[PDB]
Symmetry: C3
């Protein structure tokens, strides 16, 4: 589909969640509700990835924080790739402030994937995440939520 079209820009996905307020209220009522990014390829004939969010958090984060995760998906070129998936990911929640005025301050966490888990192995025929990515008090700060949308940024470090 157009899923195959979606390729990260230098390994980067920017995923936009709109209707944040309505969604938050849903997460609050239903702590299991998950928001999914579009699948993207890291690079051109690379790994398929997807990004996910819990607006009202989950696990330890739950009810207090936003929770961000990523997983591998079965992809067309999987047989050409190194397994497991070993490339570092950086999550950013973007502060939507005009970058002209100041360096905008993003909330960012990065992980190196752990080969000691099955999460990042070759899919067949989730992921890794942060339960306490940002707290609701911090999220209300600055411009993390603006015009009722948030930006989730996923950067995969490329050879």
């Amino acid at each position: 589909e157009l899923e195959e079209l979606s390729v990260g820009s230098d390994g980067v996905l920017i995923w936009k969640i709109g209707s944040y307020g309505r969604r938050l209220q849903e997460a609050k009522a239903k702590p299991n509700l998950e928001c999914f990014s579009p699948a993207f390829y890291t690079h051109k004939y690379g790994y398929k990835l997807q990004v996910s969010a819990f607006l009202n958090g989950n696990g330890s984060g739950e009810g207090t924080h936003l929770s961000l995760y990523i997983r591998v998906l079965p992809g067309a070129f999987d047989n050409l790739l190194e397994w497991p998936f070993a490339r570092r990911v950086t999550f950013s929640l973007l502060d939507q402030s005009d970058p002209g005025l100041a360096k905008p301050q993003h909330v960012t966490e990065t992980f190196h994937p752990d080969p000691n888990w099955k999460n990042f192995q070759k899919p067949g025929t989730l992921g890794f995440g942060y339960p306490k990515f940002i707290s609701h008090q911090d999220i209300r700060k600055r411009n993390y939520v603006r015009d009722d949308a948030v930006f989730i940024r996923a950067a995969v470090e490329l050879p």
Copy 2:
């Protein structure tokens, strides 16, 4: 339908900042212009770069303003985009317009103009707070020169200067 066409709009990104827009059926189109003014041609919306600015190019085959009946008129617009809140405003990147001379580099000369976008110009500021152009980009006489028209088609080129990337030194 119109919907996928919109999602295809999101996939429209510049090639290192460059949009090439092809107008074909030129003689016919020019004619239809003269009959029906003021007739604006629209390029597809494109993003200067990925998660960049959305811009649209415009042309009047039969001119606009100071150009009508004598010139091709070229303009560019800033459009509301999905990632505007991540961007610098007003829009401040060099734009070069070219009309392309369709000769093989076996060496060609296009008609080109550049501007630094004007901060006062209202369209270049953040959407939510009128194309800037050249009314007289090309003379109907000069267009017929060289290869500006070939096989009934013309190429409008918009090159936006992209933000250079800051690296550590190393």
Copy 3:
């Protein structure tokens, strides 16, 4: 439109052929049966190309080998380009084994200036075949050699065409 999006990743096309077993068997049933790549561009607003394979061979490779070809196609930006199309081409049948090292099957060639299909498209230059059909290898890999390693994995093959950005 749907097509004009087909680039061109540093000039690189990877074409995946599914249902290999069924397709190979179909090709046996009809000789001269051609498999076509999606059209692709060397670079954006560049040269338009297409790759094609014969599962059961063409010409001297008929019934014995996979046969691989590339042609120039008429493109929307042809008047902005140099002709004849003179870029180096690499053909690879990918060995689909994890780097943990692939024995890819690869050939590269420089085009000839007198290759008719590689001259500017849209002008008849002798027949339909000189104008429209491409160049390649009638015996890229044999039917036996392909069953080796992971040239086939999960009933698919990977063909890779790399155009050398100069």
